[PDB]
Amino acid sequence: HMETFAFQAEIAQLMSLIINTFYSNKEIFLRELISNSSDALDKIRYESLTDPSKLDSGKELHINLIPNKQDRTLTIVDTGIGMTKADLINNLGTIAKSGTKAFMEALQAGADISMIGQFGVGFYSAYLVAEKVTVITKHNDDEQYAWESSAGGSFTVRTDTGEPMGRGTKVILHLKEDQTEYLEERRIKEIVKKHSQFIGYPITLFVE
Ligand SMILES: Nc1ncc(Cl)c(C(=O)N[C@@H]2c3ccccc3-c3c(-c4nc5cnccc5[nH]4)cccc32)n1
C-alpha cells in the first residue's frame, strides 16, 4: 500500500544542497527538529484551549529523543498536532517550495545553512546527518501514516501498521555511517543544552 511521489524541483535541489555541500556544523539538525516538535505541541495545546476533546488522543505534551546504536537511528518523538495525509503530500509540499525558494535566495546572498529554520524548512536539516528519514505521524483528523525519503527525487507515503501512537510525530533519522556521534548520550545532552535549553516541554533523552 506504498504510494511514491516526486519532489518538485526546488525542494529536490535543496535536498541535494544539504547532502552535497561541505558544512561541518551538522549538529543544528537537532535544534531544528526539536523546534518543529515544540511548534506542533504549541499548536495542539492552543487548539485544546477551545476544544478540550482535542487531547482525548493523549494529554501529555512532550518530546523524547531515542538513540538506537544497533539500528543506527536517532528518533525525535513528540505528542504534538501530527500531520494528516493531505499535510504530508500537499500542504507541506507548498511550504517546502516557498521556504526553499526564500532560503536559496538568502544563501546566494550570504546566509548560512544554520539559518534554515527561519525559512520553515528546518526539517530538511535532517539530511545533514541522515541517509533516510522516516516520519510516522498521527493527527486527530486522520489515520497513522509513514512518510519516507532517501532523497533521489522521490518520497513515499503509506498507512502505518506499526505501534499505534495516539497523536504526534516520530522523525526517525537513519544516520549516515560517519554520523554515529549523534547516538552518544554525552553528545546529545551537549547539543540540547547548547540549542534547546528553553523549550517549553519536557525533553527526555533516552539512553541504552
Ligand atoms: N514534529 C513535527 N510535527 C509537525 C510537523 Cl508539520 C513537522 C515537520 O517538520 N514536518 C515536515 C515539513 C516541514 C516543512 C516542509 C515540509 C515538511 C514535511 C514533509 C513534506 N515535505 C514535502 C515536500 N514536497 C512534497 C510533500 C512534502 N511533505 C513530510 C513530512 C514531514 C515534513 N514536524
From Swiss-Prot:
Residues the entry annotates as binding ATP: N36, D78, K97, F123
PTM per Swiss-Prot/TrEMBL: ISGylated. S-nitrosylated; negatively regulates the ATPase activity and the activation of eNOS by HSP90AA1.
Official protein name in the record: Heat shock protein HSP 90-alpha
N6-acetyllysine carried by residues: K43, K69
Localization of this protein: Nucleus; Cytoplasm; Melanosome; Cell membrane
Taxon lineage: Eukaryota, Metazoa, Chordata, Craniata, Vertebrata
Domain notes: The TPR repeat-binding motif mediates interaction with TPR repeat-containing proteins like the co-chaperone STUB1.
Record's function text: Molecular chaperone that promotes the maturation, structural maintenance and proper regulation of specific target proteins involved for instance in cell cycle control and signal transduction. Undergoes a functional cycle that is linked to its ATPase activity which is essential for its chaperone activity. This cycle probably induces conformational changes in the client proteins, thereby causing their activation. Interacts dynamically with various co-chaperones that modulate its substrate recognition, ATPase cycle and chaperone function.
Region of interest (Interaction with NR3C1), residue spans: 1-208
Recorded family membership: Belongs to the heat shock protein 90 family.
Oligomer and partners: Homodimer. Identified in NR3C1/GCR steroid receptor-chaperone complexes formed at least by NR3C1, HSP90AA1 and a variety of proteins containing TPR repeats such as FKBP4, FKBP5, PPID, PPP5C or STIP1. Forms a complex containing HSP90AA1, TSC1 and TSC2; TSC1 is required to recruit TCS2 to the complex. The closed form interacts (via the middle domain and TPR repeat-binding motif) with co-chaperone TSC1 (via C-terminus). Interacts with TOM34. Interacts with TERT; the interaction, together with PTGES3, is required for correct assembly and stabilization of the TERT holoenzyme complex.
Annotated source species: Homo sapiens (Human)
Superkingdom field: Eukaryota
